[PDB]
Amino acid sequence: APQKKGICVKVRVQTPRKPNSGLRKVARVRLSTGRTVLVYIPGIGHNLNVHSVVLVRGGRCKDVPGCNYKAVRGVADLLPVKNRE
Amino acid sequence: HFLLGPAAIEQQKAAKMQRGLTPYQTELFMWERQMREIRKIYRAQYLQR
Amino acid sequence: EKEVPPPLKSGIGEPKKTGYKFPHVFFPYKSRYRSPHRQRWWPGSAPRFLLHSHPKRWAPRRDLSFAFFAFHGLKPFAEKNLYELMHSLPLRGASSFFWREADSDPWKHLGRKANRLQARGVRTQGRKQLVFSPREIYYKRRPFHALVFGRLSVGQLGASSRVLKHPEIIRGLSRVAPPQASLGGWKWRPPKDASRWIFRPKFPLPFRPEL
Amino acid sequence: WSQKQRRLLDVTDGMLMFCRKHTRLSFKKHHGVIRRQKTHYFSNVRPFLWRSSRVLEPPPLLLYRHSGKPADWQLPARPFYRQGVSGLLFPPRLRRGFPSMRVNSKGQFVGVNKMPYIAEKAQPRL
Amino acid sequence: APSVHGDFCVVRRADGGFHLVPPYPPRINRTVEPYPPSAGNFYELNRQFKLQWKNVEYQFVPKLLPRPWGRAGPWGGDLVRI
Amino acid sequence: SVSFKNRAEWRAFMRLPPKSRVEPRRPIPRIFPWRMAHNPLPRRYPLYKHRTLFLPLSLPSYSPQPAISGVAVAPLTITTNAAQLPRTALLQSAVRQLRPL
Amino acid sequence: VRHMFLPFYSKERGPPRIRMQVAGVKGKRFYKIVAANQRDPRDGKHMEVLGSYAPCTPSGVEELRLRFSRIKFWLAAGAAFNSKMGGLLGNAGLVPLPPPMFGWRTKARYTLLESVMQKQEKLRENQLREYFKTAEPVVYRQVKKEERIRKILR
Amino acid sequence: KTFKRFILRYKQKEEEAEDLLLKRTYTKPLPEGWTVLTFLEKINIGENAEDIAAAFSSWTDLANATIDVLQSVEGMTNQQRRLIVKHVRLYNHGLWPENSYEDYIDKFQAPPLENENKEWTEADDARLLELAAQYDVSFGDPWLYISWE
RNA sequence: ACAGUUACCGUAGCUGUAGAUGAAUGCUAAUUAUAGAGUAUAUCUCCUAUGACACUGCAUAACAUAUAAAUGCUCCUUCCGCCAAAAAAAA
RNA sequence: GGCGAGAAGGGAAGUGUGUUUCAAAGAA
RNA sequence: UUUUAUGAUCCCAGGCUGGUUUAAUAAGUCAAAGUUUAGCCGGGAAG
RNA sequence: GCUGUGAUGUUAAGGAGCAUAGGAAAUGCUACACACCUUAAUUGGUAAUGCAUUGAUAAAAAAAAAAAAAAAA
RNA sequence: AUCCCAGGCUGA
């Protein structure tokens, strides 16, 4: 499918694999199919919490281990990135 | 030549009417009478060829 | 409220029927199937003869009377059939002449299909009719069912309503069942060589019809 | 036929207002490059192909000037060949010599009921 | 060779003519459940089709036969007189 | 005489008579058997150079062709264009149309 | 039916007929003239493609393409057709001309109209010859003032 | 290109205007005493027949009106439009209000052939034999042609 | 069928780029073109022509081929289409 | 009284469906 | 005695077929297999 | 005269509306054509059908006086 | 087995 809706079971920040350093905004999300997957939150800043509904698309964040999906901004409870032009 | 010329239309116009039929039908029946003839003419030519 | 087919009924002169628990042979999987034997109940239709016409008549005994049994003979002109007309005529209508009008049939006046395009157009404006004279009569269910035979010929109607003038303009068939006797508007004329004993003249009216 | 119905018209100055344009020259504003080849073929080409053979516009019919009846001498037919190649070393054997027919075991021509193959004449392309 | 009329039969008509009718008893596939599942609410799911004249009866239930079917056809049955 | 001061009047004059929305109204487009789907056109400089149609003739026959009257007829080149047919090829095309069959 | 044409007759579908299948796309419609059975789908099963018919074409003249020999063959075989197909075949010359809607006998007002139209056409031809005697492409005619008139002869 | 289209359309417009004028001038008049409302009553329009008659200003307009004009008419249904079209055509063709089989026979009976009901001479016999030889009586029905000859 | 993958060569995967979809999502447009000049200031120039030359996809505008998933509840189906040449309007 | 009428079926079936190659006559 | 590693015995999942144009010396049939108006087929019951 | 009885068991394998789940899987028509059914008959009838809206996933939107043709040199 | 048949034939 092009994309699936899911519920954020966990929201946190993870450490990227070296040599990269920093904190990547990630969430464990239970898709509509029932599977739980790791999803990266692209952009600067977000309001996602637990029990938040997000639309999820295919996108691989190479830094975060095992992360293979991204969240579509501006859809469901994931607001669009601010101060973006 | 007779069937595909102007004689067929005149024969249709000259066909006699029977009580109970509109003018078109009496020409249609004569018109169909010529149709049964041309169908037989085509069959002969096709068979000979 | 909804208009639905009337319940099926058995005809006069027959035992009851058990019936069926669903309307037709396809119910309900083919809702647009119509049975050839379905009763014609909608306006502008004539009920089938001996199948759905002449249903068994039941009334409470409080209202029963001898007039209750003259219903078929008292049916109006548009509905009364040839047998019902003939039953209460001299010699059961035999030796007389009968012809049907057809100008008052229910379909020609009532129904959704009454007004429709015709091959000739709409009406804007003496006649040679079919004349039937009964000779053999036998009623299976008085007065509406009989097995009749007679002479069919071409007559000559005229201005009186219309009146038969020459019942034998052309000789047709000498022994045939009446045409369209099942139903319609029939008119009759007694023979020229009529006897006053059989065809009784009207009794004189009272001079002073006192209240 | 046009000259037979020929008529003399009266054109005024106000009748040519929109017969003239703002631009001195005319050119095609869009390229002819198809964005989706199969979709274009299915939507705008195939539905109008009622036969698989390629046939050109017929030559005009010549009518006698005085009468208007067709002339005994008419222009020759105009066949089309793809890429201009007008010959085959090995032409395929065709059943359409006697279309919709076959030979029965008795030895006689008889009819055949069969859905025609829409691409029969485009195999090979001619 | 194939048959001109197939599985239908020419039979006399109540009006003095003839017409085509399907075979009797019906050719049914009893190896499968009646469809729809609610067919029993409106039909007799164990309806039987008999062939009896006076006191003599015949038990005949058409059923599919091995191929080649040929002229005889797909369906057949046994000779059982009562 | 009619004055078309605006485009609305021009449209009114040019409009075809009304037709029912059940019959074929739009003409079927022409399809040329050599550019059925693309319509090449030029898109690269030079945009207006001269383009000549060439249709190969090749060798319609590979056997000795006797002279028609006095003209040789037998081919001498492979470069002949079928849209610019020579004298002897036209002569052959004319003789074929006159053959008795 | 002659033994040859028996396959053309379908027990399930009916006898052969010459008719037209819709073709083209929404808006741009023409017709494919085919030989099929009576109960076949109009755009579905058929036996042969006999031609095409386009009433609306860029040239402004209805176009009718037909295989003449095949139409003759199917008429010989016995394919039936309706009034429109009969009229098209009559115009094409393949069959005698069918009568008009109400019959030939019923057309006298139309013959009078045709004669009047022919007379007016001849009058306009005479006027055009009189014009040819001068043939002035541009003229000036009064309203107040004189306006230019172009005498285009289309 | 635009000029060519313009001139062709102008020619077609002139042709159509002339044809419309001729048809309107040669329209077939109604019988004595009939108006548009009378025609509508006789055809039995029923609903808003008077309104339809008011919309149609004259019998010429009613007879030469197009299906587009009939549809434009307010309150006219598809059935009414079809009825009007059929009756207008029937009247223009003289099959109504004389809508009777006897009327059809009286009006449109074909006149007898030129030589019909004439005693046969030797010239007639010779011509008949020549026609039979030409038309090969054995095939089809030669009489269809021989009778007209 | 081109490039890239930390000395070089060979295995081997991986990465971007074509094409067929046209299925979901993001941003974005839409009622399609009202109106018709002259001196548009200069330079140049024998197709002398408001030529070079420079707002008019600007019009009779157009608008297409295949499709219609699953679960539950409620309601609806009963006067289907033609033929009276189904003996009618009837010299 | 006479003709036509399957909301145009995807509910069965794997060596099946369909495909390819054939064949099919009253009036004996 | 009959089947059976050329898959018998014996589970679950799926009807099959056609569609013209089609760039490149990759075409004279689009070239092992990809479709879209359509073709063939898909029980019986008022007992 | 006084209850009742007379074939008196009628709605899904379809359609529509509303909800559920799903990223998503559908809307209007007066529809002069074809085809089909019917008829004695271009005798009568239709909504299969044909049109239009959206969809953004496709086209056309350049060149020829008298022509509707013309590989537009 | 005798309710119906606009279905038929028969009885010296």
JSON list of N, CA, C and O (backbone and C1' of nucleotides) in Angstrom, two decimals, chain I residues 16-35:
[
{"chain": "I", "resi": 16, "resn": "G", "atom": "P", "xyz": [18.61, 4.36, -4.64]},
{"chain": "I", "resi": 16, "resn": "G", "atom": "O5'", "xyz": [18.89, 5.41, -5.81]},
{"chain": "I", "resi": 16, "resn": "G", "atom": "C5'", "xyz": [19.14, 6.77, -5.51]},
{"chain": "I", "resi": 16, "resn": "G", "atom": "C4'", "xyz": [19.72, 7.50, -6.70]},
{"chain": "I", "resi": 16, "resn": "G", "atom": "C3'", "xyz": [18.95, 7.37, -8.01]},
{"chain": "I", "resi": 16, "resn": "G", "atom": "O3'", "xyz": [17.83, 8.23, -8.07]},
{"chain": "I", "resi": 16, "resn": "G", "atom": "C1'", "xyz": [21.27, 7.09, -8.40]},
{"chain": "I", "resi": 17, "resn": "U", "atom": "P", "xyz": [16.48, 7.75, -8.79]},
{"chain": "I", "resi": 17, "resn": "U", "atom": "O5'", "xyz": [16.81, 7.84, -10.34]},
{"chain": "I", "resi": 17, "resn": "U", "atom": "C5'", "xyz": [17.11, 9.09, -10.95]},
{"chain": "I", "resi": 17, "resn": "U", "atom": "C4'", "xyz": [17.84, 8.91, -12.25]},
{"chain": "I", "resi": 17, "resn": "U", "atom": "C3'", "xyz": [17.12, 8.13, -13.32]},
{"chain": "I", "resi": 17, "resn": "U", "atom": "O3'", "xyz": [16.15, 8.90, -14.02]},
{"chain": "I", "resi": 17, "resn": "U", "atom": "C1'", "xyz": [19.35, 7.36, -13.16]},
{"chain": "I", "resi": 18, "resn": "A", "atom": "P", "xyz": [14.63, 8.40, -14.13]},
{"chain": "I", "resi": 18, "resn": "A", "atom": "O5'", "xyz": [14.64, 7.45, -15.40]},
{"chain": "I", "resi": 18, "resn": "A", "atom": "C5'", "xyz": [15.08, 7.93, -16.66]},
{"chain": "I", "resi": 18, "resn": "A", "atom": "C4'", "xyz": [14.85, 6.93, -17.76]},
{"chain": "I", "resi": 18, "resn": "A", "atom": "C3'", "xyz": [13.40, 6.53, -18.02]},
{"chain": "I", "resi": 18, "resn": "A", "atom": "O3'", "xyz": [12.68, 7.48, -18.78]},
{"chain": "I", "resi": 18, "resn": "A", "atom": "C1'", "xyz": [14.74, 4.59, -17.95]},
{"chain": "I", "resi": 19, "resn": "G", "atom": "P", "xyz": [11.12, 7.72, -18.48]},
{"chain": "I", "resi": 19, "resn": "G", "atom": "O5'", "xyz": [10.43, 6.34, -18.87]},
{"chain": "I", "resi": 19, "resn": "G", "atom": "C5'", "xyz": [10.37, 5.90, -20.21]},
{"chain": "I", "resi": 19, "resn": "G", "atom": "C4'", "xyz": [10.01, 4.44, -20.32]},
{"chain": "I", "resi": 19, "resn": "G", "atom": "C3'", "xyz": [8.63, 4.04, -19.83]},
{"chain": "I", "resi": 19, "resn": "G", "atom": "O3'", "xyz": [7.59, 4.33, -20.75]},
{"chain": "I", "resi": 19, "resn": "G", "atom": "C1'", "xyz": [10.20, 2.57, -18.91]},
{"chain": "I", "resi": 20, "resn": "A", "atom": "P", "xyz": [6.22, 5.01, -20.25]},
{"chain": "I", "resi": 20, "resn": "A", "atom": "O5'", "xyz": [5.38, 3.79, -19.66]},
{"chain": "I", "resi": 20, "resn": "A", "atom": "C5'", "xyz": [4.91, 2.75, -20.50]},
{"chain": "I", "resi": 20, "resn": "A", "atom": "C4'", "xyz": [4.27, 1.64, -19.71]},
{"chain": "I", "resi": 20, "resn": "A", "atom": "C3'", "xyz": [3.20, 2.05, -18.71]},
{"chain": "I", "resi": 20, "resn": "A", "atom": "O3'", "xyz": [1.93, 2.28, -19.31]},
{"chain": "I", "resi": 20, "resn": "A", "atom": "C1'", "xyz": [4.68, 0.52, -17.69]},
{"chain": "I", "resi": 21, "resn": "U", "atom": "P", "xyz": [1.32, 3.77, -19.35]},
{"chain": "I", "resi": 21, "resn": "U", "atom": "O5'", "xyz": [1.06, 4.13, -17.83]},
{"chain": "I", "resi": 21, "resn": "U", "atom": "C5'", "xyz": [-0.17, 3.81, -17.19]},
{"chain": "I", "resi": 21, "resn": "U", "atom": "C4'", "xyz": [-0.01, 2.69, -16.19]},
{"chain": "I", "resi": 21, "resn": "U", "atom": "C3'", "xyz": [-0.87, 2.80, -14.94]},
{"chain": "I", "resi": 21, "resn": "U", "atom": "O3'", "xyz": [-2.17, 2.27, -15.13]},
{"chain": "I", "resi": 21, "resn": "U", "atom": "C1'", "xyz": [1.37, 2.18, -14.38]},
{"chain": "I", "resi": 22, "resn": "G", "atom": "P", "xyz": [-3.41, 3.25, -15.42]},
{"chain": "I", "resi": 22, "resn": "G", "atom": "O5'", "xyz": [-4.14, 3.40, -14.02]},
{"chain": "I", "resi": 22, "resn": "G", "atom": "C5'", "xyz": [-3.44, 3.23, -12.78]},
{"chain": "I", "resi": 22, "resn": "G", "atom": "C4'", "xyz": [-3.49, 4.48, -11.94]},
{"chain": "I", "resi": 22, "resn": "G", "atom": "C3'", "xyz": [-4.46, 5.56, -12.42]},
{"chain": "I", "resi": 22, "resn": "G", "atom": "O3'", "xyz": [-5.01, 6.25, -11.30]},
{"chain": "I", "resi": 22, "resn": "G", "atom": "C1'", "xyz": [-2.25, 6.42, -12.41]},
{"chain": "I", "resi": 23, "resn": "A", "atom": "P", "xyz": [-6.54, 6.02, -10.88]},
{"chain": "I", "resi": 23, "resn": "A", "atom": "O5'", "xyz": [-6.46, 5.36, -9.43]},
{"chain": "I", "resi": 23, "resn": "A", "atom": "C5'", "xyz": [-6.17, 3.98, -9.27]},
{"chain": "I", "resi": 23, "resn": "A", "atom": "C4'", "xyz": [-5.61, 3.70, -7.90]},
{"chain": "I", "resi": 23, "resn": "A", "atom": "C3'", "xyz": [-5.49, 4.90, -6.97]},
{"chain": "I", "resi": 23, "resn": "A", "atom": "O3'", "xyz": [-6.73, 5.23, -6.35]},
{"chain": "I", "resi": 23, "resn": "A", "atom": "C1'", "xyz": [-3.48, 3.67, -6.91]},
{"chain": "I", "resi": 24, "resn": "A", "atom": "P", "xyz": [-6.88, 6.62, -5.56]},
{"chain": "I", "resi": 24, "resn": "A", "atom": "O5'", "xyz": [-6.06, 6.37, -4.22]},
{"chain": "I", "resi": 24, "resn": "A", "atom": "C5'", "xyz": [-6.47, 6.97, -2.99]},
{"chain": "I", "resi": 24, "resn": "A", "atom": "C4'", "xyz": [-5.32, 7.06, -2.02]},
{"chain": "I", "resi": 24, "resn": "A", "atom": "C3'", "xyz": [-4.87, 8.47, -1.68]},
{"chain": "I", "resi": 24, "resn": "A", "atom": "O3'", "xyz": [-5.68, 9.08, -0.70]},
{"chain": "I", "resi": 24, "resn": "A", "atom": "C1'", "xyz": [-2.98, 7.13, -2.17]},
{"chain": "I", "resi": 25, "resn": "U", "atom": "P", "xyz": [-5.97, 10.66, -0.76]},
{"chain": "I", "resi": 25, "resn": "U", "atom": "O5'", "xyz": [-4.58, 11.31, -0.31]},
{"chain": "I", "resi": 25, "resn": "U", "atom": "C5'", "xyz": [-4.02, 11.00, 0.95]},
{"chain": "I", "resi": 25, "resn": "U", "atom": "C4'", "xyz": [-2.65, 11.62, 1.10]},
{"chain": "I", "resi": 25, "resn": "U", "atom": "C3'", "xyz": [-2.53, 13.08, 0.73]},
{"chain": "I", "resi": 25, "resn": "U", "atom": "O3'", "xyz": [-2.99, 13.95, 1.75]},
{"chain": "I", "resi": 25, "resn": "U", "atom": "C1'", "xyz": [-0.75, 11.89, -0.25]},
{"chain": "I", "resi": 26, "resn": "G", "atom": "P", "xyz": [-3.42, 15.45, 1.37]},
{"chain": "I", "resi": 26, "resn": "G", "atom": "O5'", "xyz": [-2.04, 16.17, 1.04]},
{"chain": "I", "resi": 26, "resn": "G", "atom": "C5'", "xyz": [-1.06, 16.35, 2.05]},
{"chain": "I", "resi": 26, "resn": "G", "atom": "C4'", "xyz": [0.12, 17.14, 1.54]},
{"chain": "I", "resi": 26, "resn": "G", "atom": "C3'", "xyz": [-0.21, 18.44, 0.83]},
{"chain": "I", "resi": 26, "resn": "G", "atom": "O3'", "xyz": [-0.50, 19.50, 1.73]},
{"chain": "I", "resi": 26, "resn": "G", "atom": "C1'", "xyz": [1.41, 17.26, -0.41]},
{"chain": "I", "resi": 27, "resn": "C", "atom": "P", "xyz": [-1.56, 20.64, 1.32]},
{"chain": "I", "resi": 27, "resn": "C", "atom": "O5'", "xyz": [-0.76, 21.52, 0.27]},
{"chain": "I", "resi": 27, "resn": "C", "atom": "C5'", "xyz": [0.42, 22.22, 0.64]},
{"chain": "I", "resi": 27, "resn": "C", "atom": "C4'", "xyz": [1.08, 22.86, -0.55]},
{"chain": "I", "resi": 27, "resn": "C", "atom": "C3'", "xyz": [0.18, 23.66, -1.47]},
{"chain": "I", "resi": 27, "resn": "C", "atom": "O3'", "xyz": [-0.10, 24.96, -0.99]},
{"chain": "I", "resi": 27, "resn": "C", "atom": "C1'", "xyz": [1.55, 22.24, -2.76]},
{"chain": "I", "resi": 28, "resn": "U", "atom": "P", "xyz": [-1.45, 25.71, -1.43]},
{"chain": "I", "resi": 28, "resn": "U", "atom": "O5'", "xyz": [-1.37, 25.74, -3.02]},
{"chain": "I", "resi": 28, "resn": "U", "atom": "C5'", "xyz": [-0.43, 26.56, -3.68]},
{"chain": "I", "resi": 28, "resn": "U", "atom": "C4'", "xyz": [-0.46, 26.36, -5.18]},
{"chain": "I", "resi": 28, "resn": "U", "atom": "C3'", "xyz": [-1.79, 26.62, -5.87]},
{"chain": "I", "resi": 28, "resn": "U", "atom": "O3'", "xyz": [-2.07, 27.99, -6.06]},
{"chain": "I", "resi": 28, "resn": "U", "atom": "C1'", "xyz": [-0.85, 24.61, -6.69]},
{"chain": "I", "resi": 29, "resn": "A", "atom": "P", "xyz": [-3.59, 28.50, -6.13]},
{"chain": "I", "resi": 29, "resn": "A", "atom": "O5'", "xyz": [-4.05, 28.16, -7.61]},
{"chain": "I", "resi": 29, "resn": "A", "atom": "C5'", "xyz": [-3.50, 28.85, -8.72]},
{"chain": "I", "resi": 29, "resn": "A", "atom": "C4'", "xyz": [-4.13, 28.42, -10.02]},
{"chain": "I", "resi": 29, "resn": "A", "atom": "C3'", "xyz": [-5.65, 28.53, -10.09]},
{"chain": "I", "resi": 29, "resn": "A", "atom": "O3'", "xyz": [-6.08, 29.84, -10.38]},
{"chain": "I", "resi": 29, "resn": "A", "atom": "C1'", "xyz": [-4.94, 26.44, -10.97]},
{"chain": "I", "resi": 30, "resn": "A", "atom": "P", "xyz": [-7.54, 30.34, -9.93]},
{"chain": "I", "resi": 30, "resn": "A", "atom": "O5'", "xyz": [-8.52, 29.64, -10.97]},
{"chain": "I", "resi": 30, "resn": "A", "atom": "C5'", "xyz": [-8.39, 29.87, -12.36]},
{"chain": "I", "resi": 30, "resn": "A", "atom": "C4'", "xyz": [-9.14, 28.84, -13.16]},
{"chain": "I", "resi": 30, "resn": "A", "atom": "C3'", "xyz": [-10.62, 28.70, -12.82]},
{"chain": "I", "resi": 30, "resn": "A", "atom": "O3'", "xyz": [-11.43, 29.67, -13.47]},
{"chain": "I", "resi": 30, "resn": "A", "atom": "C1'", "xyz": [-9.63, 26.56, -12.88]},
{"chain": "I", "resi": 31, "resn": "U", "atom": "P", "xyz": [-11.93, 30.97, -12.67]},
{"chain": "I", "resi": 31, "resn": "U", "atom": "O5'", "xyz": [-13.21, 31.45, -13.48]},
{"chain": "I", "resi": 31, "resn": "U", "atom": "C5'", "xyz": [-13.12, 31.78, -14.86]},
{"chain": "I", "resi": 31, "resn": "U", "atom": "C4'", "xyz": [-13.61, 30.65, -15.74]},
{"chain": "I", "resi": 31, "resn": "U", "atom": "C3'", "xyz": [-15.11, 30.62, -15.99]},
{"chain": "I", "resi": 31, "resn": "U", "atom": "O3'", "xyz": [-15.37, 30.10, -17.30]},
{"chain": "I", "resi": 31, "resn": "U", "atom": "C1'", "xyz": [-14.47, 28.63, -14.90]},
{"chain": "I", "resi": 32, "resn": "U", "atom": "P", "xyz": [-15.60, 31.09, -18.54]},
{"chain": "I", "resi": 32, "resn": "U", "atom": "O5'", "xyz": [-14.75, 30.43, -19.72]},
{"chain": "I", "resi": 32, "resn": "U", "atom": "C5'", "xyz": [-13.40, 30.02, -19.51]},
{"chain": "I", "resi": 32, "resn": "U", "atom": "C4'", "xyz": [-12.42, 30.95, -20.18]},
{"chain": "I", "resi": 32, "resn": "U", "atom": "C3'", "xyz": [-11.96, 30.51, -21.56]},
{"chain": "I", "resi": 32, "resn": "U", "atom": "O3'", "xyz": [-11.74, 31.65, -22.39]},
{"chain": "I", "resi": 32, "resn": "U", "atom": "C1'", "xyz": [-10.09, 30.64, -20.12]},
{"chain": "I", "resi": 33, "resn": "A", "atom": "P", "xyz": [-12.97, 32.35, -23.14]},
{"chain": "I", "resi": 33, "resn": "A", "atom": "O5'", "xyz": [-12.58, 33.90, -23.16]},
{"chain": "I", "resi": 33, "resn": "A", "atom": "C5'", "xyz": [-12.48, 34.63, -21.95]},
{"chain": "I", "resi": 33, "resn": "A", "atom": "C4'", "xyz": [-11.17, 35.38, -21.87]},
{"chain": "I", "resi": 33, "resn": "A", "atom": "C3'", "xyz": [-10.70, 36.03, -23.17]},
{"chain": "I", "resi": 33, "resn": "A", "atom": "O3'", "xyz": [-11.33, 37.27, -23.42]},
{"chain": "I", "resi": 33, "resn": "A", "atom": "C1'", "xyz": [-8.89, 34.89, -22.13]},
{"chain": "I", "resi": 34, "resn": "U", "atom": "P", "xyz": [-12.44, 37.39, -24.58]},
{"chain": "I", "resi": 34, "resn": "U", "atom": "O5'", "xyz": [-13.32, 38.64, -24.13]},
{"chain": "I", "resi": 34, "resn": "U", "atom": "C5'", "xyz": [-14.20, 38.55, -23.02]},
{"chain": "I", "resi": 34, "resn": "U", "atom": "C4'", "xyz": [-14.20, 39.82, -22.21]},
{"chain": "I", "resi": 34, "resn": "U", "atom": "C3'", "xyz": [-14.10, 41.12, -22.99]},
{"chain": "I", "resi": 34, "resn": "U", "atom": "O3'", "xyz": [-15.34, 41.54, -23.54]},
{"chain": "I", "resi": 34, "resn": "U", "atom": "C1'", "xyz": [-12.63, 41.18, -21.13]},
{"chain": "I", "resi": 35, "resn": "A", "atom": "P", "xyz": [-15.40, 42.16, -25.02]},
{"chain": "I", "resi": 35, "resn": "A", "atom": "O5'", "xyz": [-14.16, 43.15, -25.08]},
{"chain": "I", "resi": 35, "resn": "A", "atom": "C5'", "xyz": [-14.19, 44.41, -24.43]},
{"chain": "I", "resi": 35, "resn": "A", "atom": "C4'", "xyz": [-12.91, 45.17, -24.66]},
{"chain": "I", "resi": 35, "resn": "A", "atom": "C3'", "xyz": [-12.51, 45.35, -26.12]},
{"chain": "I", "resi": 35, "resn": "A", "atom": "O3'", "xyz": [-13.14, 46.48, -26.70]},
{"chain": "I", "resi": 35, "resn": "A", "atom": "C1'", "xyz": [-10.65, 44.58, -24.86]}
]
